[PDB]
Amino acid sequence: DPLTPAISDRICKHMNEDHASAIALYAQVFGQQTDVTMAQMQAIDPTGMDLVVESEGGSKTIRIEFEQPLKDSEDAAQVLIAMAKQAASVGK
Amino acid sequence: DPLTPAISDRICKHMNEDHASAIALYAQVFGQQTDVTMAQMQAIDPTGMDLVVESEGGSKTIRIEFEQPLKDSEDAAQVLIAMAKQAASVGKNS
Amino acid sequence: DPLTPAISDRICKHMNEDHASAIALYAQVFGQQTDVTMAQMQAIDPTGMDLVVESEGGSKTIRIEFEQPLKDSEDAAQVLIAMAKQAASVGKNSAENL
Amino acid sequence: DPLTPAISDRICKHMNEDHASAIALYAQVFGQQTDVTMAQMQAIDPTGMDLVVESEGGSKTIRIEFEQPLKDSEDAAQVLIAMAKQAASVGKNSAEN
Amino acid sequence: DPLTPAISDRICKHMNEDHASAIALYAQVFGQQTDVTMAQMQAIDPTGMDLVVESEGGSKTIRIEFEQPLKDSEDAAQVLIAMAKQAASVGKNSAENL
Amino acid sequence: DPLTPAISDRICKHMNEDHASAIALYAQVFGQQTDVTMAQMQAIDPTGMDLVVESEGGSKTIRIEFEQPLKDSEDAAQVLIAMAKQAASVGKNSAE
Amino acid sequence: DPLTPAISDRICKHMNEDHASAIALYAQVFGQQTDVTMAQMQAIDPTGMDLVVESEGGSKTIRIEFEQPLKDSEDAAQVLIAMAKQAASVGKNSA
Amino acid sequence: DPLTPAISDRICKHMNEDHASAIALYAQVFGQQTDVTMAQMQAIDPTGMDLVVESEGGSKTIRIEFEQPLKDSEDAAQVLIAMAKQAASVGKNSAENLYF
Numbered sequence A: 001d002p003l004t005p006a007i008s009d010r011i012c013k014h015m016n017e018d019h020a021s022a023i024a025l026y027a028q029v030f031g032q033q034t035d036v037t038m039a040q041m042q043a044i045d046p047t048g049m050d051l052v053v054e055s056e057g058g059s060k061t062i063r064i065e066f067e068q069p070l071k072d073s074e075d076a077a078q079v080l081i082a083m084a085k086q087a088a089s090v091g092k
Numbered sequence B: 001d002p003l004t005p006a007i008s009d010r011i012c013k014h015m016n017e018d019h020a021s022a023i024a025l026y027a028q029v030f031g032q033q034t035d036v037t038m039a040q041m042q043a044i045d046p047t048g049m050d051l052v053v054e055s056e057g058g059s060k061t062i063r064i065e066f067e068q069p070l071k072d073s074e075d076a077a078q079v080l081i082a083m084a085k086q087a088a089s090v091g092k093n094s
Numbered sequence C, E: 001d002p003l004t005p006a007i008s009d010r011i012c013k014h015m016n017e018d019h020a021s022a023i024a025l026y027a028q029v030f031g032q033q034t035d036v037t038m039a040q041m042q043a044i045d046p047t048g049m050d051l052v053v054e055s056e057g058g059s060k061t062i063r064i065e066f067e068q069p070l071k072d073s074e075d076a077a078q079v080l081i082a083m084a085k086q087a088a089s090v091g092k093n094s095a096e097n098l
Numbered sequence D: 001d002p003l004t005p006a007i008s009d010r011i012c013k014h015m016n017e018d019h020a021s022a023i024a025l026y027a028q029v030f031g032q033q034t035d036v037t038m039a040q041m042q043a044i045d046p047t048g049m050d051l052v053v054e055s056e057g058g059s060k061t062i063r064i065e066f067e068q069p070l071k072d073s074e075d076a077a078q079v080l081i082a083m084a085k086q087a088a089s090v091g092k093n094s095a096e097n
Numbered sequence F: 001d002p003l004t005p006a007i008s009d010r011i012c013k014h015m016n017e018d019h020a021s022a023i024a025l026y027a028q029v030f031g032q033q034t035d036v037t038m039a040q041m042q043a044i045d046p047t048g049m050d051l052v053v054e055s056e057g058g059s060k061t062i063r064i065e066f067e068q069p070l071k072d073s074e075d076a077a078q079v080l081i082a083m084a085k086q087a088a089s090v091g092k093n094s095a096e
Numbered sequence G: 001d002p003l004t005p006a007i008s009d010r011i012c013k014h015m016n017e018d019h020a021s022a023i024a025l026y027a028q029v030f031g032q033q034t035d036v037t038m039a040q041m042q043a044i045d046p047t048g049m050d051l052v053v054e055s056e057g058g059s060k061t062i063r064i065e066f067e068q069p070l071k072d073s074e075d076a077a078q079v080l081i082a083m084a085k086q087a088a089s090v091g092k093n094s095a
Numbered sequence H: 001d002p003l004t005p006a007i008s009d010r011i012c013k014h015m016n017e018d019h020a021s022a023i024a025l026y027a028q029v030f031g032q033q034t035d036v037t038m039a040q041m042q043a044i045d046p047t048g049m050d051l052v053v054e055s056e057g058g059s060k061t062i063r064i065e066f067e068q069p070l071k072d073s074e075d076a077a078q079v080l081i082a083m084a085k086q087a088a089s090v091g092k093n094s095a096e097n098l099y100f
């Protein structure tokens, strides 16, 4: 159940390097952003994640909270996977 | 996270729990297997991974090798995702 | 040239004599046959093509459908070339009985 | 499809869009040209084909002849596909300054 | 006779005096040289070869790194023989100008 | 050597000079003619051939069509040889 | 029609893909080879033809000559057709 | 380089392993042997070489002598290369049994 600054940043690097498309979906679907360009996961915490978005407003940073609290990095991956699939359906 | 049986255990249990569909795709496309009732992941290593496509009353021990060897845990996740994408594409054009 | 049953006969003839290896790949990767042996393109259609695969089971006549429909003879070659390349990548991550 | 000037137009069109990479291989291996920018198949004949590699000081108007003469459009492609495989092998064992 | 710098000098002598024509073929085929007046073999290394081409531009030292690495002096002769034969096939398709 | 009107003349002349007997068999078996004295090949098309026969009636211009269409001169020769062999077999197993 | 090395390749093809039994009959009744297992026509020239009976000891490269000279490809066909007839006659004989 | 038992074994080996065709040529042309099956270079000497041809009826040990004596291993290669081109030339002009 370890969610530290280091744990968060490796998780955010994997997402920013292997699943950058999903981060864009998070900002558009969950963060009601339209012109998503270079969406990045800045940090993730047991409660939510912080997304640096580059949209019409500019280079701002938003926060998306997870309904069920996260305990460990695995709970993060499962939630991120589920949110991306659910977000993929709304966008279509 | 470098090559170590313990790190491989967590990875094959994460895939066996979160991406069991991908394991099934591996057995059908790469393993040339037709009757996949329950495809499982027994082990992984830089050369290749070892899959077990069993059945209600059967078992298949198979080995799938990665073209380019894997060094750490994040490269294993990059190869697996890409392999699932390649297998997901084959299922479409058939 | 627009897709025609006569044009298909010409395409299948070229494939069986100049690119017979690809036909074998198509039936392993897209037809999921294990044994390879000889491989023949019996006919091609705007929706898909029919292959006669000699396999572990034996003489089988299977059909492989193209995701995007084919319009002319040129699209046939382009799809055939692309499908063979995709099979070449899968074949490179081959398997073996442990 | 017996060799005719009209057939050549079709073949050169197919090669310049679907197999332009092979045309590049032809010019370097068989044409002995090093600076390859845009390799094109202008025309093909039963004796040979004319490739164009536009470069500094004018387009490389060059002629590569097929050792054994071609009869139909199928015979042309058979020759081409084999010339490109010989070009893929040679290019692998390439040289450099 | 595993590859060594002394062994390379020996090999380059045999090729440079008994198979000097083949050296020209190497430079033309593999080194994409067109005019050849005197082709020479400076040195051979486990993975490659250094050639002096005295033609076309002029003084010109090129290197043909073999796609297959060598193990001994025998691999050099076998590789050199095979490369010359393969180069002979390209020579059969003459390249000219319009 | 794809079938062309110039190629047809070349094939028909060869057939009329080296295999005139076979042309007679075609008219009897495939053209169902009886008393053939001289048989000649006029033209060969991708789909069929024209035969000039002298039978029980007078000079007759008949047409014999090949079940499978012919593409080149080689298919013509192979088809002609097989058709002559089939006619040669009927004469062996035929009576009247 | 004019007998050229290119024409010979065309002629040998016809007699080797079709009427292949004719080539073997030739090197048996005109040629003096007894064990014929793969008779092949390598080349046709004006004076004769280079028959090759690939065998255990060696490809029996053997030459048969045409008493009457050949003029064009047509004379070749006429000469070949007639030679196969004397071969269906000498090959199948009584005792 | 200089004439030695091992020098002969490695030249005859290089020949039995890389140029077995040339050994076959040397026998047909120079040794007047015909219908050769397995031609081999048993030994090479400054004066000549000993070739072992295998024939349908009986094996053969023939000797082909070099007009000008060989001094070192390099002279051996240069002599064989020449004899092989000569035999190739004689190979192009092939005879056959005539019939009518």
Ligand code: HEB
Pocket (backbone or CB within 6 Å): A010, A011, A012, A014, A015, A019, A022, A073, A076, A077, A078, A080, A081, A082, A084, B010, B011, B014, B015, B019, B022, B073, B074, B076, B077, B078, B080, B081, B084
């Ligand atoms: C977006 C969402 C998502 C998705 C969709 C995915 C999808 C995926 N994936 Fe993932 N992952 C993830 C998210 C994800 N993912 C995460 C978050 C993680 C974690 C990371 C870290 O921790 O850093 C992972 C992780 C991971 C891993 C590792 C594990 C260990 O290390 O133990 C692997 C192998 C994978 C695979 C995979 C695959 C094959 C796929 C396809 C099916 N993955």
Ligand code: HEB
Pocket (backbone or CB within 6 Å): C010, C011, C012, C014, C015, C019, C022, C073, C076, C077, C078, C080, C081, C082, C084, D001, D010, D011, D014, D015, D019, D022, D073, D074, D076, D077, D080, D081, D084
């Ligand atoms: C498999 C796949 C494939 C491949 C790999 C190929 C490869 C090739 N290719 Fe190919 N193609 C093809 C498929 C193909 N292909 C097709 C399908 C076609 C069409 C045919 C018909 O139409 O018939 C062609 C066709 C063709 C042509 C045309 C001919 C005529 O016109 O008739 C040419 C020229 C060529 C070339 C070529 C080359 C050079 C190569 C190498 C790179 N192609």
Ligand code: HEB
Pocket (backbone or CB within 6 Å): E010, E011, E012, E014, E015, E019, E022, E073, E076, E077, E078, E080, E081, E082, E084, H010, H011, H014, H019, H022, H073, H074, H076, H077, H078, H080, H081, H084
């Ligand atoms: C180009 C390529 C090539 C070729 C073609 C050849 C071809 C030949 N070859 Fe040689 N080789 C060679 C490259 C060569 N080669 C080399 C590299 C060697 C080695 C050298 C040294 O080691 O130094 C030899 C080596 C050799 C030897 C040895 C020597 C000693 O031991 O010292 C001999 C004998 C010979 C012969 C010969 C012949 C007979 C022939 C046929 C013509 N070669």
Ligand code: HEB
Pocket (backbone or CB within 6 Å): F010, F011, F012, F014, F015, F019, F022, F073, F076, F077, F080, F081, F084, G011, G014, G015, G019, G022, G073, G074, G076, G077, G080, G081, G082, G084
């Ligand atoms: C009827 C059917 C038939 C038959 C049976 C035959 C049979 C025969 N055949 Fe014959 N062919 C023919 C039909 C035929 N065929 C044709 C169609 C041709 C083509 C012609 C033209 O193109 O003109 C020939 C062609 C021919 C040739 C070529 C010539 C030139 O180039 O000009 C020769 C060599 C011959 C041989 C022969 C022989 C040896 C025989 C056996 C006796 N053919």
